[PDB]
Amino acid sequence: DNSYKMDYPEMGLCIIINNKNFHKSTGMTSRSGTDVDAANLRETFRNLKYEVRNKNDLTREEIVELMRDVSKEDHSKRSSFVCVLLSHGEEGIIFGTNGPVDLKKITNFFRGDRCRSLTGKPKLFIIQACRGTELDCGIET
Amino acid sequence: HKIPVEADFLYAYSTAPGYYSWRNSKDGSWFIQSLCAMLKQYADKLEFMHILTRVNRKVATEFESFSFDATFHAKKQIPCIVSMLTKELYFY
């Protein structure tokens, strides 16, 4: 079978974590324009029939608790799962408002053996965040 | 019998490993802008990986940083599709 079954009763959840404002003790700048992203994403996934949940300005603790909780839901009638993370970051790391969290700790909640109602179903993570400090100078075509 | 526990994940990264990711103060991040446009235009027709390949092209060809700081000026971005998917994904 070559295509994911997407005719479950629900397309699935689309969790959007939109971190704009960070504790000043982190040294991190406000992410101007991210509200436009979060609203673009909400309308887009609404038209794809996802149950969109927008969460704003979450600490690292609230991100891990939210992902734990979402991962413990019954997704049996859902075709898929989508998580969108909009924040500062480094390689392998997304920032809550108060500090870093490993992306692996987020995605592990949805492993095939830990979220049984999503086993065999597509789990999409859309990650708008830096992955280091290198700059691409490009090349003329 | 069994499948790997890492199977059926897709990580749609805004930028290549190691690099900054870029954002416009008014219009939003280049990647999210591009991803919403491509989904709006193509989610009823194209398979998800092919939509993401169009996002890669849109980000790579249509965006270039403008900065008063010459260190951050005229920079480019390519997104990074990481697929551990085992089937094709159509949103209709």
Binding site: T29, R31, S32, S87, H88, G89, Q128, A129, C130 | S14, Y20, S21, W22, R23, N24, S25, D27, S29, W30, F63, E64, S65, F66, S67, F72
Partner: peptide, 5 residues
């Protein structure tokens, strides 16, 4: 087109 993440 101006700041980074």
């Amino acid at each position: 087109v101006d700041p980074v993440d």
